[PDB]
Design a protein around this ligand. Structure first.
Ligand SMILES: N#C/C=C/c1cc(Cl)cc(Oc2ccccc2OCCn2ccc(=O)[nH]c2=O)c1
Lengths: 405, 538
C-alpha cells in the first residue's frame, strides 16, 4: 500500500536488452494478457522517453492450458541493488533439504497487490513484438510489483511474514521458504495429509509440485565387481581410478597397470593377482569415504555441469571448485521427452536449478553440452519455470562422460 | 475554425552531467543570410518557431544549402537516449493497397515546451554589425536525435482507435509512411482511405504512389515482389571497397535469386582493411561470379504469404561449407530464398552445418511469418536418428521430411561402443622434441606387428595423430586402437567428416575405408602395458 524506495547499484543504468523473436500464438497470448493487466492497472503503456527494455515471452505451467507471462529479469536483477533488509540477510533454512516432502507453490498473485517505487518503474519496461516489424511493438511498464524481479520478494517479505504468521505458529514442524514467485513448504507428514495441509495453506492465502528431498541422492563413485577381467575392462578401470585420484588422495593404480604389461588383445581375459585385488580393494575402501574438506561458500558462484548419457539419461554435478563436488545426480525421468534432446535438457536444468534453490537458497550457473544457437532457438518452448538460471556452453566433448555412468 | 486536437508532448531531459550545447555561429555569406531570414520569417508565421532573447545562452550552429540546415550534432551528443525493415514475403496478399506518406512530418508534432530552450539557433546579421537574430523550435526539428521516436509514438497513438473501429482493414506503420490494405472493393477501400486521412486531419496531419512501389531496395507489385536491379561493377582492378560493396549487393540479391555464392569473395577480405588494393581471383571465384551473372540473367519474383497454406523450407548442400535454402508454400513459387555459410571451425561435419542452417531459417521464419516452417532435408531419417542418438551434445531439429536430392547428408564413419573380438589391437603412441622439432610415431600390436616412423618438423599432437593414422593404414577392415592421447580422441569424438588439418582428413578417409573401428583411451605414463613411451622417445 506504500512504496518502499528502490534504486540501482552505483554507476549502473537501467537494462537495455534486445527482445527476441516470438511465435504468433505467444504474441497473441501476451497481447490479451497485457490488455487484461492494463485494465487492472498492473501495467501502463509508455512513450519513447523510456529507452530501457527487458525481454518477455509466454509459457504454459504444469497441468494447465492457460498461457502465462514470463519476463526475463536477469540483467535487471543483477543491475538491481543488492537487496538487504531488516531481515538481516536471512540464512538459508537448511532444514528444508532434510525434510521428507516439499511442495512448491506459485505465490505470484500476491505481488500484484503492492505498488512499486515511482522512480524505479522505468526500469521494468518491456515490449510485445509484432510479426515482421509491421507495426511498432507495444510497450508497457509495471505499476505493481512484477514477478521474476529479485526486489519483489525482498519487498514482500514483511507482508508474507504477516500473512504466514498464524500457520507457522500453529505447526512449527512445517518449514517455509520463499524464492522469487515460488514458495517452498516442507513437511515430514503423509502425502495425503501433506496435500490437505497444502489446501489449508493456500486457502489461508486466499482469505488474505511434489518433491522428496529425503529421497534425493548424493552419488558415491563405484567400481565394477567381476569374476573375469578383459584387458579393456582393466584399462577403463585404470582410467576411472586415475581420474578419481584427482579427487581422492590415496588412489594408486600401479599394481593394476602391472597387469596390462605387454601387448594383449582388448578382449583377452586377464586374471587378477593378489596384489592387484588388494589394490582394488583399498581403492574401494577409499571411495566409500566422503571428500576431504568440502564446504559451501556463499560468496562463491555455484557451477552446474550436465552430461548426456543417452537413452534418456543425464548426469550432473554441482560444485564451486573443481574436483570438490557439493552435489552429484542422475536424471532418467521420462515424460513425453523421448524424441527430443533439448526438451530433456531443459527439464533437467529446471530440476537441477530447483534442487539448488532448495539446498543453497540460490541458482547455479550451468555449463550446457549444447550449441549456443540450438539452445537459444528452442529453450523457451519447453520452459515451465518462473525463474531463470545463468548458462554457458561447452562445445568440447568431456572424456569424463562415462566416468559418471 | 474547426479546433484541431492537441498532441500531448513527450517529456524530454538531457544526459546527466552534461548541460545544453554552446557553439559559435559560423560566418555565412549575405545571400545565405537573406534566405535564412526569409525562411525563418515565414516559418515563424506558420508557428513552427519563435524568437528568443539573451536569456538563452545555448546556441546551435546553422547553415543554408534555399533550404535551411541546422546542425544538432553537439545537442545530439548531449540529448538523452530514446527507444529492421518488414520483409515483403511476410506481407499477406490483399486486394487493394494504399501508400500514404505524411508531408511536413516532424513539424506537425509539437515539442516538449521545457525542452524548447535547448533548440535555439542564431542567424548572423550583415557584417556582424547587429545582434544575430535568435530563434527556437516549437516542434520536432529535422535532424534531431529524438524526432523519429516521438513522431512514430504520436502517430501510433493517433492511429490506434481507427484500427479497432475498422478491423476489416490492415494498417502497417513504418517510419514516416503508412501502408493500408484490404480485401474490400476499391470503392469501399478508397472511402476508408478518405476516412483515415480525415481522421489524421483532425490531429492536423497532412497526407497526399501506385503499384509497383519502389521501397527500401524492393519492388512491390500487386501479386508479387522482387528486388530493385542490382548494379554489378566491372573492372580489371578489384579493390577492397569493391569487394565490400559486391558482398553486400550479392547478399541482398540472395534473398530471392537462388544459388548465389559469396564465399570466394569473402575470403579476399580476411585481414585487409586497405581501401584500395588490386586482388586477383581464383578460377573457382571466376566461374562462381560468372554463374552469378548467369543467375542474374533472367530475373524471378517472390510471392506473398497466405496464412492458410503450410510454410515449407527446403535446404540443399552447395558444397565447400555453403548451404542454400528456399522458403515456399506451393511448388515452384517461392516466398523467399537464402543461404548459410559455415561458422569458422577447425573440424566440422555436414550434419552440424545442416542443423545450424535449420536453426537460422527457424529464427528468420519466426521473425517474418511468426512461425516455424516444415523442413525438407537432404538427409535420411535413419541418418539423423543414429547421429542425434549417439551425439554427445544435445541436439534437435523441428518437424521435417526427407527429400532425395543429392548430395545427401550421410554419416561417413561410426565408432564401436565395445572392443571388437577377433580384431587386431593396435597400441599406438607418438612424441616430439619441442627443441629440435624431431619426433617419432608408431604402434605395437598383439600379433607382434610393430612400426616406428621418425619425423621432422612436428609436434606432440601431430605425432599422436600420426600414430593413429599409421594404425589405420596397416590394419584390416576391423581394428581396435588404443591411445594415450586425449587430443586425438577429443578430435575423433567430435566426428568431423572434414578438417583443415590434412593429417586429420587422412585419418577420416582411413576411417571411411574401415568396417569396424574401436578407439580406446588410457592414461599416459601410468605404466599401462602395450603403451610404449620408450619406442618414440629414443
Ligand atoms: N512505398 C511503399 C509501400 C510499401 C509497403 C510496405 C509494407 Cl510493410 C506493406 C505494404 O502493403 C500492405 C499494407 C497492408 C497490408 C498488406 C500489405 O501488403 C500485402 C502484399 N501486397 C503488397 C503490395 C500490393 O500491391 N498488394 C499486396 O497484396 C506496402
Amino acid at each position: 500500500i506504500e512504496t518502499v524506495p528502490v534504486k540501482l547499484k552505483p554507476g549502473m543504468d537501467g537494462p537495455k536488452v534486445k527482445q527476441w523473436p516470438l511465435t504468433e500464438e505467444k504474441i497473441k497470448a501476451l497481447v490479451e494478457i497485457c490488455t487484461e493487466m492494463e485494465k487492472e492497472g498492473k501495467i501502463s503503456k509508455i512513450g519513447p522517453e523510456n529507452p530501457y527494455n527487458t525481454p518477455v515471452f509466454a509459457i504454459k505451467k504444469k497441468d494447465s492450458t492457460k498461457w502465462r507471462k514470463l519476463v526475463d529479469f536477469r540483467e535487471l536483477n543483477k543491475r538491481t541493488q543488492d537487496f538487504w533488509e531488516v531481515q538481516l540477510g536471512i540464512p538459508h533454512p537448511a532444514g528444508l533439504k532434510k525434510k521428507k516432502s516439499v511442495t512448491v507453490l506459485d505465490v505470484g498473485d500476491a505481488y500484484f497487490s503492492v505498488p512499486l517505487d515511482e522512480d524505479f518503474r522505468k526500469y521494468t519496461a518491456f515490449t510485445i513484438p509484432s510479426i515482421n516489424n509491421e507495426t511498432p511493438g507495444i510497450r508497457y511498464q509495471y505499476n505493481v510489483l512484477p514477478q521474476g524481479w529479485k526486489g519483489s520478494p525482498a519487498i514482500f517479505q514483511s507482508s508474507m511474514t504477516k500473512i504466514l504468521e498464524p500457520f507457522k505458529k500453529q505447526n512449527p514442524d512445517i518449514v517455509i521458504y520463499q524464492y522469487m514467485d515460488d514458495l517452498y513448504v516442507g513437511s515430514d507428514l503423509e502425502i495425503g495429509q501433506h496435500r490437505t495441509k497444502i489446501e489449508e495453506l493456500r486457502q489461508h492465502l486466499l482469505r488474505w509440485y511434489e518433491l522428496h528431498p529425503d529421497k534425493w541422492t548424493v552419488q558415491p563413485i563405484v567400481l565394477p565387481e567381476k569374476d573375469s577381467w578383459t584387458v579393456n575392462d582393466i584399462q577403463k578401470l585404470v582410467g576411472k581410478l586415475n581420474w578419481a585420484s584427482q579427487i581422492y588422495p590415496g588412489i594408486k593404480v600401479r599394481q593394476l597397470s602391472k597387469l596390462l604389461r605387454g601387448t594383449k588383445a582388448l578382449t583377452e581375459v586377464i586374471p587378477l593377482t593378489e596384489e592387484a585385488e588388494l589394490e582394488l580393494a583399498e581403492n574401494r575402501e577409499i571411495l566409500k569415504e566422503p571428500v576431504h574438506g568440502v564446504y559451501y561458500d556463499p560468496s562463491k558462484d555455484l557451477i552446474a555441469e550436465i552430461q548426456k548419457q543417452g537413452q534418456g539419461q543425464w548426469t550432473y554435478q554441482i560444485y564451486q571448485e573443481p574436483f570438490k563436488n557439493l552435489k552429484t545426480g542422475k536424471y532418467a525421468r521420462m515424460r513425453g521427452a523421448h524424441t527430443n534432446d533439448v526438451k530433456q535438457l531443459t527439464e533437467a536444468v529446471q530440476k537441477i536449478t530447483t534442487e539448488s534453490i532448495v539446498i543453497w537458497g540460490k541458482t547455479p550457473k550451468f555449463k550446457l553440452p549444447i550449441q549456443k544457437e540450438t539452445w537459444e532457438t528452442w529453450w523457451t518452448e519447453y520452459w515451465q519455470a518462473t525463474w531463470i538460471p545463468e548458462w554457458e556452453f561447452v562445445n568440447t566433448p568431456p572424456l569424463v562422460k562415462l566416468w559418471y555412468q | 475554425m474547426v479546433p484541431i486536437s492537441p498532441i500531448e508532448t513527450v517529456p524530454v531531459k538531457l544526459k546527466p552531467g552534461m548541460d545544453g550545447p554552446k557553439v559559435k555561429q559560423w560566418p555565412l555569406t549575405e545571400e545565405k543570410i537573406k534566405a535564412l531570414v526569409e525562411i525563418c520569417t515565414e516559418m515563424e508565421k506558420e508557428g513552427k518557431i519563435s524568437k528568443i532573447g539573451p536569456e538563452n545562452p545555448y546556441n546551435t550552429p546553422v547553415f543554408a544549402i534555399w533550404r535551411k540546415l541546422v546542425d544538432f550534432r553537439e545537442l545530439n551528443k548531449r540529448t538523452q537516449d530514446f527507444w529492421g525493415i518488414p520483409h515483403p514475403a511476410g506481407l499477406k496478399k490483399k486486394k487493394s493497397v494504399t501508400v500514404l506518406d505524411v508531408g511536413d512530418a516532424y513539424f506537425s508534432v509539437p515539442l516538449d515546451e521545457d525542452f524548447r530552450k535547448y533548440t535555439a539557433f542564431t542567424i548572423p546579421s550583415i557584417n556582424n554589425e547587429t545582434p544575430g537574430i535568435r530563434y527556437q523550435y516549437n516542434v520536432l526539428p529535422q535532424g534531431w536525435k529524438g524526432s523519429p521516436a516521438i513522431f512514430q509514438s504520436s502517430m501510433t497513438k493517433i492511429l490506434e482507435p481507427f484500427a479497432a473501429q475498422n478491423p476489416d482493414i490492415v494498417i502497417c506503420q513504418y517510419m514516416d509512411d503508412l501502408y493500408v490494405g484490404s480485401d474490400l472493393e476499391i470503392g469501399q477501400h478508397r472511402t476508408k482511405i478518405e476516412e483515415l486521412r480525415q481522421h489524421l486531419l483532425r490531429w492536423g496531419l497532412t497526407t497526399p504512389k501506385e503499384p509497383p512501389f519502389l521501397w527500401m531496395g524492393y519492388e512491390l507489385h500487386p501479386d508479387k515482389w522482387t528486388v530493385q536491379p542490382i548494379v554489378l561493377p566491372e573492372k580489371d582492378s578489384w579493390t577492397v571497397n569493391d569487394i565490400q560493396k559486391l558482398v553486400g549487393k550479392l547478399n541482398w540479391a540472395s534473398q530471392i535469386y537462388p544459388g548465389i555464392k559469396v564465399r570466394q569473395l569473402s575470403k579476399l577480405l580476411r585481414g585487409t582493411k586497405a581501401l584500395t588494393e588490386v586482388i586477383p581471383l581464383t578460377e573457382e571465384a571466376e566461374l562462381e561470379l560468372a554463374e552469378n551473372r548467369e543467375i542474374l540473367k533472367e530475373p524471378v519474383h517472390g510471392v506473398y504469404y497466405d496464412p492458410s497454406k503450410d510454410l515449407i523450407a527446403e535446404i540443399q548442400k552447395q558444397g565447400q561449407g555453403q548451404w542454400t535454402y528456399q522458403i515456399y508454400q506451393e511448388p515452384f513459387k517461392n516466398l523467399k530464398t537464402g543461404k548459410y555459410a559455415r561458422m569458422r571451425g577447425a573440424h566440422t561435419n555436414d550434419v552440424k552445418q545442416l542443423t545450424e542452417a535449420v536453426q537460422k531459417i527457424t529464427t528468420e521464419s519466426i521473425v517474418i511469418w511468426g512461425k516455424t516452417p516444415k523442413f525438407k532435408l537432404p538427409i535420411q531419417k535413419e541418418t539423423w536418428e543414429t547421429w542425434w542418438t549417439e551425439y554427445w551434445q544435445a541436439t534437435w531439429i523441428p518437424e521435417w521430411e526427407f527429400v532425395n536430392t543429392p548430395p545427401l547428408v550421410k554419416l561417413w564413419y561410426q565408432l564401436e561402443k565395445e572392443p571388437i573380438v577377433g580384431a587386431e589391437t593396435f597400441y599406438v603412441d607418438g612424441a616430439a622434441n619441442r627443441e629440435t622439432k624431431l619426433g617419432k610415431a608408431g604402434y605395437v600390436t598383439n600379433k607382434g606387428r610393430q612400426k616406428v616412423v621418425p619425423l621432422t618438423n612436428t609436434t606432440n599432437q601431430k605425432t599422436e595423430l600420426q600414430a593413429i593414422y599409421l594404425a589405420l593404414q596397416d590394419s584390416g577392415l576391423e581394428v581396435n586402437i588404443v591411445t594415450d592421447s586425449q587430443y586425438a580422441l577429443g578430435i575423433i569424438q567430435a566426428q568431423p567428416d572434414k578438417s583443415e588439418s590434412e593429417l586429420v582428413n587422412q585419418i577420416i578417409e582411413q576411417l571411411i575405408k574401415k568396417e569396424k573401428v574401436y578407439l580406446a583411451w588410457v592414461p599416459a605414463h601410468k605404466g599401462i602395458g602395450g603403451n610404449e613411451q620408450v619406442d618414440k622417445l629414443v
